Amino acid sequence: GIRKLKPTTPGQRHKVIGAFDKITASTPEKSLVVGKKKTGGRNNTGKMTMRYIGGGHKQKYRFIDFKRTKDGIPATVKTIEYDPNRSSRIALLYYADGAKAYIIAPDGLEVGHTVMSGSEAAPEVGNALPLANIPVGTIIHNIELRPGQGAKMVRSAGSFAQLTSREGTYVVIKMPSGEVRRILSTCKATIGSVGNSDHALEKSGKAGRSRWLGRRPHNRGVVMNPVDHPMGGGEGRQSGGHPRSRKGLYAKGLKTRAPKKHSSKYIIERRK
Amino acid sequence: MNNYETVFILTPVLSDAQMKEAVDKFTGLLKQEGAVIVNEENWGLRKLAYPIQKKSTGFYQLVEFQANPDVIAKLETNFRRDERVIRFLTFRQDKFAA
Amino acid sequence: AHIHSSFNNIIISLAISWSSAGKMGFRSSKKNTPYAAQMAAQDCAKVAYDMGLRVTVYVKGPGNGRESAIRTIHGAGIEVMEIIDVTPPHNGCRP
Amino acid sequence: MYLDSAKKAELFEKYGKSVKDTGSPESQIALFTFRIAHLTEHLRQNKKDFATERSLKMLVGKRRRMLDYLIKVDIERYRAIIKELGIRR
Amino acid sequence: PNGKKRKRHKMATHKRKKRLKKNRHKK
Amino acid sequence: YIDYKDPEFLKKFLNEQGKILPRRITGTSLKFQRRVAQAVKRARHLALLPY
RNA sequence: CGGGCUUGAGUUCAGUGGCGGCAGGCGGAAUUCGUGGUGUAGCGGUGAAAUGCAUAGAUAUCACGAGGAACUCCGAUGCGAAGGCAGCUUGCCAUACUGCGACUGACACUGAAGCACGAAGGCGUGGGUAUCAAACAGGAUUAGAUACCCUGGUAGUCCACGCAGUAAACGAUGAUUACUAGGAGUUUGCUCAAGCUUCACAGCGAAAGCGUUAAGUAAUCCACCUGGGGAG
RNA sequence: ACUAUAGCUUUACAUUGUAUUGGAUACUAACUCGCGGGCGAGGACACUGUAUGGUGGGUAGUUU
RNA sequence: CCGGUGCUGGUAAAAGCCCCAGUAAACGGCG
RNA sequence: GGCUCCCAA
Ligand SMILES: [K+]
Ligand SMILES: [K+]
Ligand SMILES: [K+]
Ligand SMILES: [Mg+2]
Ligand SMILES: [Mg+2]
Ligand SMILES: [Mg+2]
Ligand SMILES: [Mg+2]
Ligand code: NA
């Protein structure tokens, strides 16, 4: 759900934000949060390697459980919670042993539900199973790439993948980008799609909101001088020629995947 | 409160004991929701008119029963969560058919 | 022995070899005629009999010359063991 | 609605003289109100059941006609039945 | 059912529908 | 009521290729033909008759 | 105005339905693309051709993988206020017809304003995108071809929510009630009553024609017309 | 504009081995990655060194 | 508008190049 | 200050 702001201000006329309807708690679990220090896009030499990063609201880091190791121990959903670090919401789980954890909240998960992990776990929403136990055709997220490493694949708000066929020790999965690829049957995934699918409908409305989110203004290359950018220069407006970066990397069709990568043997169809 | 009959087909790749255990699990899932079983019969291992998922043969079984008009969705969810059933259908019998 | 016919052309494929009215020489208003189909059948059968294989028919399309092609294939070399029709649309795509 | 024979008999027994009072005012009113409530709860979930919506409008008109007949007959029964069921809104 | 009755109605609809298109995107 | 079971009886109302015979070719009544057609399609969905 | 009656109207009960509405699941044929076997001089299209695909490897043919749309035979009949409704199944609704020796007692008809629904095409946001296909591009025929024919092809066609409110939205025939002749079929409920369509008395009509489903005989209310253009 | 050149990229040799009907397949033991404090996934490829052919105003020295 | 320029494809002891196909909210052109 | 509200948490 989203909320549109009435046009009492020019900076509010085009603002659309979320309704925060699924959030049930206002403060985070203390044992699972730590203060976060911001980079301005600078690496360990102090030189800025990534542009347009800096400022924004102070944030705390929530430790998200992407491994789901406690197999067979049931957990109960305590609260649905806001996370400043990612687009999706998180869910606080209490285990029967007194452990507490955070997971990425799937769509349709409510307070009071029970989740499990492992081969014995039922293929319902919020359960984390090896892909060899997931019946063909269901909607999954938080997909592992190597057994035991942790979820890497389907994590953003609203995104989902589908398990379409299994071929021996591998399964065929269609990815959010449209790629079709093989994943080992030992890898884990969580049933359901990621919640908060209305994230893409939000509109900032003003430059200040990007400043709050921690982004700095971006300058086009055509309005620089030739000493700063290949596309710069000229008197009056000029098109800049073929679009390219500061180092001259073409920006309108040149592929940059390494064309000898071993992971190509596990890709069936390509869409990126 | 209604009379139903469910006819399903089991994969021939499964064993006889596996098929019996699957049928028992289906009957137990039906009884968990709350129902009586009028009859359960096994047409047996027989060929099909057309190939079903590359095998042209399967095990035909059916069960006639009485249940509340709410366990059908649970039966369908179990049928989809079990990947050893290749075809299923469910019918309601009126007073003339029953 | 698959015979793919239509309102415009008739082609035959045995598998190994193939033939068609356009390959035989007929171009327009003659490919869908009894002469061209039998000529193409003879052209394919000249290599069919000289192949070591002696078959079922899989006529697919409707056209004038399927009977002539089947008769020529039966007469030259091997004989038509069975003409099983495979002509194939249960309310499919809009034409 | 559920509209069971037991529910109809209980409604008739509560509203009107004896169970057999199936076709009198203050009982047709109760039956129509029950059906209207159940149809509203059904249309809350099925927002495209326009036939059910039209049937609900017809039921509302029928209840209005019965209430108008009660108006023509007297006012005490009118006041009693509307106070009991809850009508004016 | 003469036929010529509907020809006049068809013809004036064409003039009306064409006259509006000349200034549709014309601000 | 005609059961979809025992499709040998159902084959009496079918043609050589398996299609359903028209009512004017076998007599019958409208209700009987509708029941037969319903029973045929239930068998097709249960792999008891070719499509 | 004050009482009564049950025939009209409505409620209940039983029987009989149904391409009636909404929602969730399941399907085979055809067809599209991608990746691999066989194989090579054409394929496609037309009145005749050409534009197009094809030896840096087509049509055809055998497989595996990923998808979208439509429901052959039954099938002409039935349902819905109308628009409309057709693969199989289930759930939740609505509704109709027939009767009861059950109930209430004129509670009825119509309806200016208003409200609701309302084919196709069209608009906005998000999905999806196989076929067909406005606009557009090329090839033909013609004096010309801004068309008819052929090859491509984007919106659209599909789904969800929201606008829009139009049609040869037609039976070119508003709703309700009562009465008045025969033939030929058909469906359901059992010789009878509902419904469904064409010949046809009286009568009506300018005529074609309508004729128990009236455009006949009568009563109640609503809508609309007053020569053709201009002009919806 | 002339001449070079970082980077990217092609092949050969080295790292680098074994079998079967050569250039394909297969194997695991070199080599790489993940998990836990051996197991799993790859695999003679990838990576890197030497040589070689392309590309290279990204950079440099100059000429005009 | 894909003609041109870019871009995506199909010698030491094979890349390229050619050719053909696509791309203009790519640079660019619309006498 | 508790407290209320809000999202940039
Ligand atoms: K900018
Ligand atoms: K420069
Ligand atoms: K007549
Ligand atoms: Mg400047
Ligand atoms: Mg200038
Ligand atoms: Mg320089
Ligand atoms: Mg110097
Ligand atoms: Na210029």
mmCIF file of C-alpha atoms in Angstrom, chain A:
data_model
loop_
_atom_site.group_PDB
_atom_site.id
_atom_site.type_symbol
_atom_site.label_atom_id
_atom_site.label_comp_id
_atom_site.label_asym_id
_atom_site.label_seq_id
_atom_site.Cartn_x
_atom_site.Cartn_y
_atom_site.Cartn_z
ATOM 1 C CA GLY A 1 0.000 0.000 0.000
ATOM 2 C CA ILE A 2 1.041 3.574 -0.755
ATOM 3 C CA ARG A 3 -0.045 7.053 0.313
ATOM 4 C CA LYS A 4 -0.181 10.085 -1.970
ATOM 5 C CA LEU A 5 0.481 13.505 -0.455
ATOM 6 C CA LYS A 6 -1.883 16.362 -1.234
ATOM 7 C CA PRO A 7 -0.284 19.227 -3.213
ATOM 8 C CA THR A 8 0.014 21.808 -0.451
ATOM 9 C CA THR A 9 3.681 22.339 -1.389
ATOM 10 C CA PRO A 10 5.540 22.072 -4.716
ATOM 11 C CA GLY A 11 7.893 19.639 -3.003
ATOM 12 C CA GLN A 12 4.907 17.531 -1.926
ATOM 13 C CA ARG A 13 2.771 17.564 -5.087
ATOM 14 C CA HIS A 14 4.478 14.492 -6.587
ATOM 15 C CA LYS A 15 5.348 12.607 -3.380
ATOM 16 C CA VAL A 16 4.160 9.016 -2.900
ATOM 17 C CA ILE A 17 5.341 7.029 0.124
ATOM 18 C CA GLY A 18 4.466 3.694 1.649
ATOM 19 C CA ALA A 19 1.624 3.212 4.095
ATOM 20 C CA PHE A 20 3.638 1.051 6.549
ATOM 21 C CA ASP A 21 0.537 -1.093 7.023
ATOM 22 C CA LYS A 22 2.292 -4.413 7.742
ATOM 23 C CA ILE A 23 4.697 -3.010 10.362
ATOM 24 C CA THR A 24 3.758 -4.047 13.901
ATOM 25 C CA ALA A 25 6.680 -2.767 16.020
ATOM 26 C CA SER A 26 8.374 0.625 16.170
ATOM 27 C CA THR A 27 11.738 -0.159 17.804
ATOM 28 C CA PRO A 28 14.255 -2.892 16.922
ATOM 29 C CA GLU A 29 15.463 -5.827 18.978
ATOM 30 C CA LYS A 30 18.431 -4.537 20.965
ATOM 31 C CA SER A 31 20.533 -7.717 20.855
ATOM 32 C CA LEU A 32 20.401 -7.797 17.026
ATOM 33 C CA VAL A 33 21.262 -4.172 16.151
ATOM 34 C CA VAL A 34 24.625 -2.419 16.007
ATOM 35 C CA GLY A 35 25.620 1.101 15.057
ATOM 36 C CA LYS A 36 26.704 1.529 11.452
ATOM 37 C CA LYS A 37 29.502 3.769 10.189
ATOM 38 C CA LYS A 38 29.074 5.362 6.780
ATOM 39 C CA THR A 39 31.522 5.469 3.912
ATOM 40 C CA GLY A 40 31.458 8.457 1.635
ATOM 41 C CA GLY A 41 32.284 6.066 -1.162
ATOM 42 C CA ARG A 42 35.896 6.088 0.057
ATOM 43 C CA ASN A 43 38.076 2.987 0.325
ATOM 44 C CA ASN A 44 40.834 2.213 2.840
ATOM 45 C CA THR A 45 43.271 4.639 1.184
ATOM 46 C CA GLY A 46 40.833 7.486 1.861
ATOM 47 C CA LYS A 47 40.362 8.186 -1.851
ATOM 48 C CA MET A 48 36.809 8.218 -3.187
ATOM 49 C CA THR A 49 36.302 5.332 -5.612
ATOM 50 C CA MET A 50 32.486 5.440 -5.838
ATOM 51 C CA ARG A 51 30.740 8.751 -6.470
ATOM 52 C CA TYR A 52 27.432 10.243 -5.263
ATOM 53 C CA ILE A 53 27.497 8.650 -1.784
ATOM 54 C CA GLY A 54 27.445 10.562 1.471
ATOM 55 C CA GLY A 55 25.348 12.036 4.209
ATOM 56 C CA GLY A 56 21.860 10.810 4.949
ATOM 57 C CA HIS A 57 20.193 9.651 8.120
ATOM 58 C CA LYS A 58 22.137 7.753 10.756
ATOM 59 C CA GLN A 59 21.373 4.035 10.515
ATOM 60 C CA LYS A 60 21.748 0.894 12.599
ATOM 61 C CA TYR A 61 22.518 -2.524 11.149
ATOM 62 C CA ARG A 62 20.181 -5.470 11.699
ATOM 63 C CA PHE A 63 21.813 -8.897 11.594
ATOM 64 C CA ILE A 64 19.724 -10.859 9.083
ATOM 65 C CA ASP A 65 19.860 -14.662 9.165
ATOM 66 C CA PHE A 66 20.519 -15.678 5.559
ATOM 67 C CA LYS A 67 21.639 -19.239 6.411
ATOM 68 C CA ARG A 68 18.708 -20.730 8.397
ATOM 69 C CA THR A 69 20.899 -23.293 10.127
ATOM 70 C CA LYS A 70 18.596 -24.317 13.015
ATOM 71 C CA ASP A 71 16.970 -27.165 11.117
ATOM 72 C CA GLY A 72 13.968 -28.826 12.723
ATOM 73 C CA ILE A 73 13.560 -26.308 15.562
ATOM 74 C CA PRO A 74 10.274 -24.431 14.993
ATOM 75 C CA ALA A 75 10.119 -20.663 15.306
ATOM 76 C CA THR A 76 7.259 -18.231 15.862
ATOM 77 C CA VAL A 77 6.808 -14.876 14.141
ATOM 78 C CA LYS A 78 6.924 -12.101 16.743
ATOM 79 C CA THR A 79 6.864 -8.788 14.841
ATOM 80 C CA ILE A 80 7.123 -7.317 11.350
ATOM 81 C CA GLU A 81 9.685 -4.564 11.340
ATOM 82 C CA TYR A 82 11.122 -1.701 9.305
ATOM 83 C CA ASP A 83 14.709 -2.100 8.078
ATOM 84 C CA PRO A 84 16.644 0.998 6.931
ATOM 85 C CA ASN A 85 19.287 -1.206 5.290
ATOM 86 C CA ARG A 86 17.117 -2.950 2.681
ATOM 87 C CA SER A 87 13.945 -2.482 0.662
ATOM 88 C CA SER A 88 11.965 -5.367 2.174
ATOM 89 C CA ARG A 89 10.622 -5.642 5.707
ATOM 90 C CA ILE A 90 12.054 -8.013 8.284
ATOM 91 C CA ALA A 91 10.430 -10.453 10.685
ATOM 92 C CA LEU A 92 11.526 -11.239 14.235
ATOM 93 C CA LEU A 93 11.565 -14.966 15.032
ATOM 94 C CA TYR A 94 11.660 -16.488 18.504
ATOM 95 C CA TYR A 95 12.914 -20.065 18.578
ATOM 96 C CA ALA A 96 11.889 -22.662 21.145
ATOM 97 C CA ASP A 97 15.455 -22.642 22.539
ATOM 98 C CA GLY A 98 15.422 -18.927 23.371
ATOM 99 C CA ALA A 99 17.384 -17.825 20.309
ATOM 100 C CA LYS A 100 16.123 -14.761 18.450
ATOM 101 C CA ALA A 101 16.639 -14.006 14.780
ATOM 102 C CA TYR A 102 15.660 -11.770 11.877
ATOM 103 C CA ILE A 103 14.547 -12.988 8.456
ATOM 104 C CA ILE A 104 13.382 -11.243 5.307
ATOM 105 C CA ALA A 105 9.600 -11.118 5.568
ATOM 106 C CA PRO A 106 7.810 -12.874 2.684
ATOM 107 C CA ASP A 107 4.473 -11.766 1.302
ATOM 108 C CA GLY A 108 1.543 -13.036 3.332
ATOM 109 C CA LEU A 109 3.454 -13.660 6.569
ATOM 110 C CA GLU A 110 1.600 -12.628 9.724
ATOM 111 C CA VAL A 111 2.370 -12.441 13.430
ATOM 112 C CA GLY A 112 1.870 -15.768 15.193
ATOM 113 C CA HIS A 113 2.832 -18.068 12.321
ATOM 114 C CA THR A 114 5.313 -20.919 12.729
ATOM 115 C CA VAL A 115 8.283 -21.485 10.417
ATOM 116 C CA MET A 116 10.795 -24.306 10.045
ATOM 117 C CA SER A 117 13.966 -25.093 8.120
ATOM 118 C CA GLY A 118 15.312 -28.364 6.771
ATOM 119 C CA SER A 119 14.264 -31.292 4.630
ATOM 120 C CA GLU A 120 11.456 -32.197 7.049
ATOM 121 C CA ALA A 121 9.898 -28.718 6.845
ATOM 122 C CA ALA A 122 6.605 -28.347 4.994
ATOM 123 C CA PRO A 123 6.681 -26.365 1.696
ATOM 124 C CA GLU A 124 4.638 -23.486 3.153
ATOM 125 C CA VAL A 125 5.413 -19.771 3.335
ATOM 126 C CA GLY A 126 8.427 -18.825 5.441
ATOM 127 C CA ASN A 127 9.950 -22.309 5.554
ATOM 128 C CA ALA A 128 13.496 -22.824 4.287
ATOM 129 C CA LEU A 129 14.050 -26.120 2.442
ATOM 130 C CA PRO A 130 16.700 -27.668 0.203
ATOM 131 C CA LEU A 131 15.695 -27.322 -3.436
ATOM 132 C CA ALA A 132 15.514 -31.109 -3.847
ATOM 133 C CA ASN A 133 12.480 -31.127 -1.509
ATOM 134 C CA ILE A 134 10.549 -28.225 -3.077
ATOM 135 C CA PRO A 135 7.749 -29.456 -5.393
ATOM 136 C CA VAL A 136 8.141 -28.263 -8.968
ATOM 137 C CA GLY A 137 6.452 -24.977 -9.843
ATOM 138 C CA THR A 138 6.383 -23.086 -6.542
ATOM 139 C CA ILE A 139 7.415 -19.510 -5.813
ATOM 140 C CA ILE A 140 10.666 -19.141 -3.867
ATOM 141 C CA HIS A 141 13.068 -16.487 -2.616
ATOM 142 C CA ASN A 142 16.382 -16.254 -0.732
ATOM 143 C CA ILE A 143 18.135 -18.778 -2.962
ATOM 144 C CA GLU A 144 21.554 -20.138 -2.050
ATOM 145 C CA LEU A 145 24.295 -20.520 -4.660
ATOM 146 C CA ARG A 146 26.567 -22.876 -2.708
ATOM 147 C CA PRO A 147 25.416 -25.192 0.106
ATOM 148 C CA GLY A 148 25.840 -23.483 3.457
ATOM 149 C CA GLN A 149 27.028 -20.093 2.208
ATOM 150 C CA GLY A 150 23.713 -18.302 2.716
ATOM 151 C CA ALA A 151 21.003 -16.704 0.597
ATOM 152 C CA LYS A 152 22.263 -14.540 -2.262
ATOM 153 C CA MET A 153 19.803 -14.644 -5.150
ATOM 154 C CA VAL A 154 16.212 -13.472 -4.593
ATOM 155 C CA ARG A 155 16.140 -10.836 -1.854
ATOM 156 C CA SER A 156 14.745 -7.456 -2.970
ATOM 157 C CA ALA A 157 11.239 -6.249 -2.145
ATOM 158 C CA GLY A 158 8.604 -8.060 -4.185
ATOM 159 C CA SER A 159 11.002 -10.202 -6.212
ATOM 160 C CA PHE A 160 10.551 -13.935 -6.725
ATOM 161 C CA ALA A 161 11.912 -16.844 -8.743
ATOM 162 C CA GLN A 162 10.332 -20.077 -9.941
ATOM 163 C CA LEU A 163 11.527 -23.685 -9.859
ATOM 164 C CA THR A 164 10.384 -25.022 -13.223
ATOM 165 C CA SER A 165 12.117 -28.408 -13.627
ATOM 166 C CA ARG A 166 14.672 -30.661 -11.944
ATOM 167 C CA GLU A 167 17.424 -32.483 -13.860
ATOM 168 C CA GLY A 168 19.416 -34.889 -11.690
ATOM 169 C CA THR A 169 21.588 -33.098 -9.135
ATOM 170 C CA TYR A 170 20.495 -29.696 -10.489
ATOM 171 C CA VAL A 171 17.210 -27.816 -10.792
ATOM 172 C CA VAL A 172 16.138 -25.237 -13.368
ATOM 173 C CA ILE A 173 15.141 -21.852 -11.943
ATOM 174 C CA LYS A 174 13.756 -18.795 -13.727
ATOM 175 C CA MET A 175 15.242 -15.643 -12.092
ATOM 176 C CA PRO A 176 13.688 -12.177 -11.648
ATOM 177 C CA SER A 177 15.857 -10.850 -14.486
ATOM 178 C CA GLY A 178 14.494 -13.512 -16.849
ATOM 179 C CA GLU A 179 17.597 -15.704 -16.782
ATOM 180 C CA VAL A 180 17.111 -19.470 -16.670
ATOM 181 C CA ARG A 181 19.858 -21.296 -14.825
ATOM 182 C CA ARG A 182 20.764 -24.473 -12.964
ATOM 183 C CA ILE A 183 21.176 -24.520 -9.182
ATOM 184 C CA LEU A 184 22.403 -27.482 -7.142
ATOM 185 C CA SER A 185 19.759 -29.545 -5.350
ATOM 186 C CA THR A 186 21.616 -29.170 -2.041
ATOM 187 C CA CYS A 187 21.107 -25.384 -1.953
ATOM 188 C CA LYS A 188 18.349 -23.898 0.208
ATOM 189 C CA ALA A 189 15.501 -21.537 -0.635
ATOM 190 C CA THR A 190 12.535 -20.029 1.207
ATOM 191 C CA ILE A 191 9.013 -20.572 -0.113
ATOM 192 C CA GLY A 192 7.076 -17.491 -1.180
ATOM 193 C CA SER A 193 7.798 -14.150 -2.767
ATOM 194 C CA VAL A 194 9.374 -11.222 -0.951
ATOM 195 C CA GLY A 195 6.876 -8.863 0.645
ATOM 196 C CA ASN A 196 6.490 -5.097 0.211
ATOM 197 C CA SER A 197 5.863 -5.289 -3.526
ATOM 198 C CA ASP A 198 4.627 -1.670 -3.573
ATOM 199 C CA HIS A 199 8.178 -0.367 -3.089
ATOM 200 C CA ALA A 200 8.519 0.492 -6.794
ATOM 201 C CA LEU A 201 5.450 2.763 -6.720
ATOM 202 C CA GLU A 202 7.008 5.273 -4.310
ATOM 203 C CA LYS A 203 8.041 8.686 -5.621
ATOM 204 C CA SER A 204 10.431 10.908 -3.692
ATOM 205 C CA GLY A 205 8.940 14.259 -4.702
ATOM 206 C CA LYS A 206 11.989 16.407 -3.933
ATOM 207 C CA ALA A 207 15.791 16.397 -3.878
ATOM 208 C CA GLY A 208 15.871 16.469 -0.085
ATOM 209 C CA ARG A 209 14.547 12.919 0.163
ATOM 210 C CA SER A 210 17.474 11.612 -1.902
ATOM 211 C CA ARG A 211 19.744 13.582 0.407
ATOM 212 C CA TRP A 212 18.083 11.814 3.367
ATOM 213 C CA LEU A 213 18.582 8.456 1.653
ATOM 214 C CA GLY A 214 22.280 9.244 1.376
ATOM 215 C CA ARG A 215 22.859 10.160 -2.268
ATOM 216 C CA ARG A 216 24.688 13.156 -3.663
ATOM 217 C CA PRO A 217 23.908 14.998 -6.922
ATOM 218 C CA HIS A 218 25.078 13.537 -10.231
ATOM 219 C CA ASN A 219 26.636 15.737 -12.930
ATOM 220 C CA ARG A 220 26.270 14.967 -16.622
ATOM 221 C CA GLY A 221 29.427 14.593 -18.671
ATOM 222 C CA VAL A 222 28.395 17.025 -21.409
ATOM 223 C CA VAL A 223 28.481 20.031 -19.047
ATOM 224 C CA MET A 224 32.104 19.453 -18.001
ATOM 225 C CA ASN A 225 35.328 20.546 -19.660
ATOM 226 C CA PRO A 226 37.335 18.175 -21.898
ATOM 227 C CA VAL A 227 39.993 17.829 -19.191
ATOM 228 C CA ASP A 228 37.399 16.219 -16.877
ATOM 229 C CA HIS A 229 35.306 14.068 -19.223
ATOM 230 C CA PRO A 230 35.597 12.790 -22.816
ATOM 231 C CA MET A 231 32.014 13.907 -23.524
ATOM 232 C CA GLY A 232 32.744 17.407 -22.227
ATOM 233 C CA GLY A 233 33.727 20.535 -24.089
ATOM 234 C CA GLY A 234 32.302 22.667 -26.848
ATOM 235 C CA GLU A 235 30.716 26.107 -26.928
ATOM 236 C CA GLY A 236 26.997 26.048 -26.377
ATOM 237 C CA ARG A 237 25.290 22.696 -26.092
ATOM 238 C CA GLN A 238 26.912 19.741 -27.841
ATOM 239 C CA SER A 239 25.862 16.101 -27.942
ATOM 240 C CA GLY A 240 29.139 14.659 -26.640
ATOM 241 C CA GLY A 241 29.494 12.019 -29.351
ATOM 242 C CA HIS A 242 29.144 8.352 -28.514
ATOM 243 C CA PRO A 243 28.187 8.078 -24.816
ATOM 244 C CA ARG A 244 30.987 6.709 -22.646
ATOM 245 C CA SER A 245 32.377 6.985 -19.129
ATOM 246 C CA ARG A 246 35.377 8.973 -17.862
ATOM 247 C CA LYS A 247 37.730 6.156 -18.896
ATOM 248 C CA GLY A 248 36.042 5.822 -22.294
ATOM 249 C CA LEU A 249 33.970 2.691 -21.647
ATOM 250 C CA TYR A 250 31.145 2.580 -24.194
ATOM 251 C CA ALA A 251 27.728 2.913 -22.561
ATOM 252 C CA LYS A 252 25.303 1.800 -25.302
ATOM 253 C CA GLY A 253 25.762 -1.876 -26.026
ATOM 254 C CA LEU A 254 29.195 -3.150 -25.028
ATOM 255 C CA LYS A 255 28.997 -6.355 -23.005
ATOM 256 C CA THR A 256 31.218 -6.624 -19.943
ATOM 257 C CA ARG A 257 30.689 -10.154 -18.644
ATOM 258 C CA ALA A 258 33.955 -12.060 -18.901
ATOM 259 C CA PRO A 259 33.535 -14.384 -21.892
ATOM 260 C CA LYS A 260 35.386 -17.293 -20.324
ATOM 261 C CA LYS A 261 33.546 -17.593 -16.991
ATOM 262 C CA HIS A 262 32.885 -21.150 -15.856
ATOM 263 C CA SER A 263 29.376 -20.255 -14.648
ATOM 264 C CA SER A 264 28.235 -20.081 -18.287
ATOM 265 C CA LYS A 265 27.889 -23.878 -18.319
ATOM 266 C CA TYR A 266 25.071 -23.545 -15.756
ATOM 267 C CA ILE A 267 23.089 -20.889 -17.675
ATOM 268 C CA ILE A 268 20.394 -22.097 -20.083
ATOM 269 C CA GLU A 269 18.963 -18.795 -21.361
ATOM 270 C CA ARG A 270 20.285 -15.257 -20.954
ATOM 271 C CA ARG A 271 18.441 -12.019 -20.204
ATOM 272 C CA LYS A 272 20.362 -9.185 -18.526
#
